[PDB]
Amino acid sequence: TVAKAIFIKCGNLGTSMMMDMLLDERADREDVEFRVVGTSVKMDPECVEAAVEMALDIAEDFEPDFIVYGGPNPAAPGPSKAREMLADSEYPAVIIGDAPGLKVKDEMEEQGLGYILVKPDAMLGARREFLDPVEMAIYNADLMKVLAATGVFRVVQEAFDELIEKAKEDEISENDLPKLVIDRNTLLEREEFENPYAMVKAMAALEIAENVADVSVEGCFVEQDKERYVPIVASAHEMMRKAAELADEARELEKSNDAVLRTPHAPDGKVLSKRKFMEDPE
Amino acid sequence: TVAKAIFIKCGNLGTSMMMDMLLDERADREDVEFRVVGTSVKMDPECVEAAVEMALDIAEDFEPDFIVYGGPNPAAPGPSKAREMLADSEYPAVIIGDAPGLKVKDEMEEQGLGYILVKPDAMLGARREFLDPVEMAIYNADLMKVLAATGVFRVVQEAFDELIEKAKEDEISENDLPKLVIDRNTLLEREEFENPYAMVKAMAALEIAENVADVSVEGCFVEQDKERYVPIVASAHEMMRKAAELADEARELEKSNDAVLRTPHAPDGKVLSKRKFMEDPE
Amino acid sequence: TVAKAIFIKCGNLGTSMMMDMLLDERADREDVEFRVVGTSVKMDPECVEAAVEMALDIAEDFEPDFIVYGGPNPAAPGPSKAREMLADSEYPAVIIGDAPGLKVKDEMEEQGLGYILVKPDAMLGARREFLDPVEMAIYNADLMKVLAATGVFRVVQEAFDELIEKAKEDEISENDLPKLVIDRNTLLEREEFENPYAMVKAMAALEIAENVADVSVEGCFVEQDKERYVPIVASAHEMMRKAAELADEARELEKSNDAVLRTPHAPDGKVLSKRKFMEDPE
Amino acid sequence: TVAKAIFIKCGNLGTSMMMDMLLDERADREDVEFRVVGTSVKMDPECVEAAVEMALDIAEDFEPDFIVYGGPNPAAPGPSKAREMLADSEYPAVIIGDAPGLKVKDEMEEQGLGYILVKPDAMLGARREFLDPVEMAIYNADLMKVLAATGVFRVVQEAFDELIEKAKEDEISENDLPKLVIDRNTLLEREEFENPYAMVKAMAALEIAENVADVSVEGCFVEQDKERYVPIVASAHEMMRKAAELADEARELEKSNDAVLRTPHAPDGKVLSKRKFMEDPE
Amino acid sequence: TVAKAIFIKCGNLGTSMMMDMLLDERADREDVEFRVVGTSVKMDPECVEAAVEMALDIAEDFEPDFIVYGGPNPAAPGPSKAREMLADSEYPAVIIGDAPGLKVKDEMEEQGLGYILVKPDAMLGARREFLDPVEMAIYNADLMKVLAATGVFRVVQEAFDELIEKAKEDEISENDLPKLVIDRNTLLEREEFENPYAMVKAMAALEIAENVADVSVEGCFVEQDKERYVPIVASAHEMMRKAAELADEARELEKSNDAVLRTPHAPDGKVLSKRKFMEDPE
Amino acid sequence: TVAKAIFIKCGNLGTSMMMDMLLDERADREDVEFRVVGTSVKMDPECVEAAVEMALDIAEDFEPDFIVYGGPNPAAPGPSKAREMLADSEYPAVIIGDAPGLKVKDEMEEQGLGYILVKPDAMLGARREFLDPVEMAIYNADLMKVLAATGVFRVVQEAFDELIEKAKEDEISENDLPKLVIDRNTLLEREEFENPYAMVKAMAALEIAENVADVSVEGCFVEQDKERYVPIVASAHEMMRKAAELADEARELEKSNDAVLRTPHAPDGKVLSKRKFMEDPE
Ligand SMILES: [Ca+2]
Ligand SMILES: [Ca+2]
Ligand SMILES: [Ca+2]
Ligand SMILES: [Ca+2]
Ligand code: NA
Ligand code: NA
Ligand code: NA
């Protein structure tokens, strides 16, 4: 069977940027097929309706087993609009969001939606005096490094791989929808790292990343004096840069013991595994 | 006037991943509206066809001033189909590809398409023994850092901004379409860096990035013995990691002189410029 | 004209370890004379009582102009006994503590005590499984680098230097006593850094340093399973190491512009200042 | 049995700054109680005499098992006074000092004092044009990191732990007092490092730290021309910084093998040991 | 019982600079005797002819078993004359050169010469505006690091050691003369690295080092505008600096496993081997 | 005129390896011609006398303006033979050596010889258990970076350039001969670094390099237990590696100010100067 899903991207989060690609890293999967639609960075109610409508329009022919809405702050006006529309749709739907989604965790279960809220997927320092396209991409670069090297992306990968296998027995029930909150302590229940210091360095990275959001929030929404708010948002970016360096250090430790976890997909979709560099994944 | 555009994303490149976001870094532009559609990592002809048909169906209602197709290797079977379909459509169109696109540069011109070919946007080590979702993401983080901190995204950003200004006087002649090839020497014609060492560091990072593609191609397409091809593709990833490190050192040099170029969009879409941290974009 | 003071140290904080030394960095001040007493790391009620009694015993002959009590958490049972005893004594007194001291800031004002509360002077990860004497020292080394390179210790230096001038003009009124809370945003009202990026890196280090506190608290007092709390307290120490690296990076940027603020004391206690390596402090 | 000691601190040394805290790193030892007295940075004969009288007064009632005097240059006029007073006293006494102390090593033995001379505990660059309080603290941060991560603090910790055992067993004989000189080669006879390159990095760190002393000495007491002595003392500080870097590198190497030695105290004072991050100290 | 050889050096390459020393690292071999002659950096025909004459003049009394010529580009006019003169001589001879030498590989075989062509021994950025003596020597330091830490020099050592052993049986036929081309992929048939990530980092380093050559050639022989060619040659140097960093990283990874290959010669010239730091080579 | 010199190399030092090359870094000097002869690493009296013979034979027809003998320790038996032979000969001669040469500095002046003694050009750890060819090369790479980037090689370049200009007014009399001792403090009398922190980082590198010599001597000539001398020699290498890192950091500081001093030769021999990257050397 070919399992299918539609991904909807409104606004930008590090996780929503990569979510579809984590499931087919070499485009060699024979068991899945995805369509991806969105309105780029705009996530006002007008644009978000427009984007979900598109997805629902596509869904008529594509017939996906589930839909995913990925974007900042599921509690915001435009994202709230998407949850409602997806709540009302026949389609199982999963919401990927950041820490502010916690305000509506309770609502989302009520609405029968699944969710993955990634606390270290932090808001950047969005002030005109500091944030231009290059700085925005540099931030995302650092953030991607953190969410990848700490193993956060593997948690998301595994959630969706589990969902996809259930879709292959065609019956995704709401009992099957992910309900995950990801943060520093998530690493404590995983077997991601063979070396414990790699693990603690990743935890440190995730803690720093999750602290960034507080700083960005003070600089964009609270501080009104530019002499103070520009330095504040800039410090946020400096923190994320160090978070990335910590995550790289963790990965380098796993390398020093030839113990880097790789979990690639096989053409049939099965998730393989390996630790040693020259061992075949199995 | 509002310039409208549809981005189509099949397979993945550093540039195609950020291209739309580079144009509206704080989602505060009042002069642009975007739709994004794609098939994720799949870029076989059948999926690319579906992808382009999705944009054309959305365009009837949306009325894009131009369409951007973004993805690896414009010469490959899938992208070549996209070029035929877009070349045939009523909408002006731009192809964003990597170095392999050079094989068909003359054709795209003969097709009346624009293009932006980014040579440092290198193909990764796509072998199952090595590239899992986490590795794919780490490679993308490093590559994003390289394209952003060396100023490649700024070159892309300006080319689209020039096109958008022309879309607003509604008449994009095929003469309005970018026809760019970006590589190491692109930095020579720019005033990105105030410090010459930052510039030559960025150049070195782009050189290394472009060299990575040849390593990946040998490991993925030429070498058939896994005992050889797995280390080959891995070595390619170690190179991109060091390019990202050069790119970061360049940026740090610019910070050390309070000379970081920032070119944020104003809400009316105008590109502003500043160098000193506490100076107002203007 | 010779200011005299006693310093009492119960338990350890980065600031309390250095506070006296920061006032006579080459032992060549002829305008000060200090005594230091304490109970080492012990800060239980009976130990603090003993330290304070020690200070008051030698105060009889020494005649200090003021007394400084320095250590962890002023709202804890031990330091609370210190505050009570020092408030009721005849001597002007200042309490040096960390962020937990905020709980009793009003009360200290009511007691007629001065205070300097250093929020980045974060509690370390005190679990036996992890914290041995070497790890304790390594932590203090990183914290000390953070407090110093960011300029936190200058702010401490300046508050004491003003207090001491008042002491010499013999009239330390309650209105003379410091009432400082130091945090990341303290940098915004100072002129420590010539280079703005140095300033924002130092902000980031103070922000991370402050966040180490919560993590330590979680690991030592909240989490009760050692499979979880050991990794938690270790991640706090990795955070602090990286904050120290930010602080270093900020100091290297100042060196790059030959703009390192130095404010040494003259023999008569006047605080001089210089920026350029080769310039004399004046 | 509770062993009791008084620690006397005149002037500053990395080792005397931490000596007492090294013995009770989580403040949970039930077999020791300490008092700490001193005159901060001042160590002329007047101030040392007053610090020792403070210690001897307290000793009347506190009744310590031993007294420790810590600070720079045991052969200097102040510290020489402290040696004469302690040697003539009824209390066993240990002198902690630095390399210059070797000049009176033989005298200290005839005086019946213990010593611990730490050759890497080097004098900093004390010239007004360079050393302000922040610089002073940055140096100590670096030296502390060297003394800690190299195992030097462990060697000191163990010496006092042995002496404490003797004390709880009523027989502090002259023959049980420490007689140590610590340097690079000290590491050759211990088992601090599981990895031999960590050991040799550590050894290099100690050698550099020892050599720093010679540079400071030249800059402070030999060279009289400011155009020469300011760069000299500054260069000594850059050396210590890179010694701290080596020591960090040593520790990271141990982390890579999950072999970090930790020797924390039990509540009853027993020195436990472990190497694996997740194992109980035993 | 002894092997004798003359080394002739015209111009400079990393391999040619170290080639003799690699064979007697402690000056304690009893089974070899060398002479070295050259014309320093000059490798024009007149100079090379003078070099080879000296060698051939020395050879009359010295009776070498073989002669080595080492220098840039075996295919240029000078080196070409050395090849003919040495091939027409009665002495077996080996040419050590860089990648341009591939142009005359078949000519050398037809000449009866051996060769070792090192592709990563890359020409530097030889433009007056940039290359002074200090910059030349820095490039060389970086390049030496690369060729050494990656194991290229060990391949060279082994090639020359095999020839020395055959020469101790006086009969070097042409067929015994090495015929080697060394590049990134040479590592895949070696067992230099115990850790596979050290290996792939080494590969990366050698790839980058080989790419440097193309940059230099462009900057020295193609580009004529100084505003362009000075950035270009400096960029090549930044690349080599990062290759050396990669090679260092690789060697550190091997230290972290106590698995650094060392292959010293015994006094009788036997090539020993060890892996573990403390173990005698056998 | 065309100045001519012959360089004799017996033993290896950093300085003697590069000495001839620092004078014609691009081989485009039309005013010098050099011959180089040596016995490679061997510097016993029999080899040294063979080396000098080669040189004097060639001189007969070559007619050099001066002769230079470079190698380890002028005081040892071989180089002592060189001094006597060169002192007796008709040719003005210069001895290049390390700190141990200071023992015969008086003697060399009596002999009418010039000398350049390089204190930082420190002996490596030559014990067979540690020092193989790759290790020997890695040492030399770090040492070369140190001597180059600190500006020691420039001082050497200058000395020799001066002597060459004297030869072109044809009269290298004995008082034209260099009598240089280079160490850390040499930097104090130079205007090498524009940034004062680069200067002091360089001094620290030179201090550490100089101290390496002592660790080497101890591990090769004093310590007899291999359990000890192996870590000891290896620790000397770790020190050199950090010295190389310090010198690199100094050069990056200069880069950050676009202030890298470059002193290339023009084709007629004139030493030119520049500091700005895009400036023509004059
Ligand atoms: Ca169709
Ligand atoms: Ca001056
Ligand atoms: Ca011979
Ligand atoms: Ca011929
Ligand atoms: Na915007
Ligand atoms: Na008074
Ligand atoms: Na010394």
Coordinates of N, CA and C in Angstrom, one line a residue, chain C residues 193-241:
Chain C
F193 N 31.6 47.6 27.0 CA 32.2 47.1 25.8 C 32.2 48.1 24.7
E194 N 33.4 48.3 24.1 CA 33.4 49.1 22.9 C 32.7 48.5 21.7
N195 N 32.8 47.2 21.5 CA 32.2 46.5 20.4 C 30.9 45.9 20.8
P196 N 29.9 46.3 20.1 CA 28.5 45.8 20.3 C 28.3 44.3 20.4
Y197 N 29.1 43.6 19.5 CA 28.9 42.2 19.5 C 29.5 41.5 20.7
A198 N 30.5 42.2 21.2 CA 31.1 41.8 22.5 C 30.1 41.9 23.6
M199 N 29.4 43.0 23.5 CA 28.3 43.3 24.5 C 27.3 42.2 24.5
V200 N 26.8 41.9 23.3 CA 25.7 40.9 23.1 C 26.1 39.5 23.4
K201 N 27.4 39.1 23.1 CA 27.9 37.9 23.5 C 28.0 37.8 25.1
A202 N 28.4 38.9 25.7 CA 28.4 38.9 27.2 C 27.1 38.8 27.8
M203 N 26.0 39.3 27.1 CA 24.7 39.2 27.6 C 24.2 37.8 27.5
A204 N 24.6 37.2 26.4 CA 24.2 35.8 26.2 C 24.8 34.9 27.2
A205 N 26.1 35.2 27.6 CA 26.7 34.4 28.6 C 26.0 34.5 30.0
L206 N 25.6 35.8 30.3 CA 24.9 36.0 31.6 C 23.5 35.4 31.6
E207 N 22.9 35.4 30.5 CA 21.6 34.8 30.3 C 21.7 33.2 30.5
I208 N 22.6 32.6 29.9 CA 22.9 31.2 30.1 C 23.3 30.8 31.5
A209 N 24.1 31.7 32.1 CA 24.6 31.5 33.5 C 23.4 31.6 34.5
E210 N 22.5 32.6 34.3 CA 21.3 32.6 35.0 C 20.4 31.4 34.9
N211 N 20.3 30.9 33.7 CA 19.5 29.7 33.4 C 20.1 28.4 34.0
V212 N 21.4 28.4 34.2 CA 22.0 27.2 34.8 C 21.4 27.0 36.2
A213 N 21.0 28.0 36.9 CA 20.4 28.0 38.2 C 19.2 27.0 38.3
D214 N 18.2 27.2 37.4 CA 17.0 26.4 37.3 C 17.3 25.0 37.1
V215 N 18.2 24.7 36.2 CA 18.6 23.4 35.9 C 19.2 22.7 37.1
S216 N 20.0 23.4 37.9 CA 20.7 22.9 39.1 C 19.6 22.6 40.1
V217 N 18.7 23.5 40.2 CA 17.6 23.4 41.2 C 16.8 22.2 40.9
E218 N 16.5 22.0 39.7 CA 15.7 20.8 39.2 C 16.3 19.5 39.6
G219 N 17.6 19.4 39.3 CA 18.4 18.2 39.5 C 18.7 17.9 41.0
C220 N 18.8 18.9 41.8 CA 19.2 18.7 43.2 C 18.0 18.6 44.2
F221 N 16.9 19.3 43.8 CA 15.8 19.4 44.7 C 14.4 18.8 44.2
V222 N 14.3 18.7 42.9 CA 13.0 18.3 42.3 C 13.0 16.8 41.8
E223 N 13.8 16.6 40.8 CA 14.0 15.3 40.2 C 14.5 14.3 41.3
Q224 N 13.9 13.2 41.5 CA 14.4 12.3 42.6 C 15.0 10.9 42.1
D225 N 14.9 10.7 40.8 CA 15.5 9.5 40.2 C 16.9 9.7 39.6
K226 N 17.9 9.0 40.1 CA 19.3 9.4 39.8 C 19.6 9.2 38.3
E227 N 18.9 8.3 37.7 CA 19.0 8.0 36.2 C 18.6 9.3 35.5
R228 N 17.8 10.2 36.2 CA 17.5 11.5 35.6 C 18.3 12.6 36.1
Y229 N 18.5 12.6 37.5 CA 19.1 13.8 38.0 C 20.6 14.0 37.8
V230 N 21.3 12.9 37.6 CA 22.7 13.0 37.3 C 22.9 13.7 35.9
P231 N 22.3 13.1 34.9 CA 22.4 13.8 33.6 C 21.9 15.3 33.7
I232 N 20.8 15.6 34.4 CA 20.3 17.0 34.6 C 21.4 17.9 35.2
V233 N 22.0 17.5 36.3 CA 23.0 18.4 36.9 C 24.3 18.6 36.0
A234 N 24.6 17.5 35.3 CA 25.8 17.5 34.4 C 25.5 18.5 33.3
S235 N 24.3 18.5 32.7 CA 24.0 19.4 31.6 C 24.1 20.9 32.1
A236 N 23.8 21.2 33.4 CA 24.0 22.5 33.9 C 25.5 22.9 33.8
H237 N 26.3 22.0 34.2 CA 27.8 22.3 34.1 C 28.2 22.5 32.7
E238 N 27.7 21.8 31.7 CA 28.1 22.0 30.3 C 27.6 23.4 29.8
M239 N 26.4 23.8 30.3 CA 25.9 25.1 30.0 C 26.9 26.2 30.5
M240 N 27.3 26.0 31.7 CA 28.2 27.0 32.3 C 29.6 27.1 31.6
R241 N 30.1 26.0 31.1 CA 31.3 26.0 30.4 C 31.1 26.8 29.1

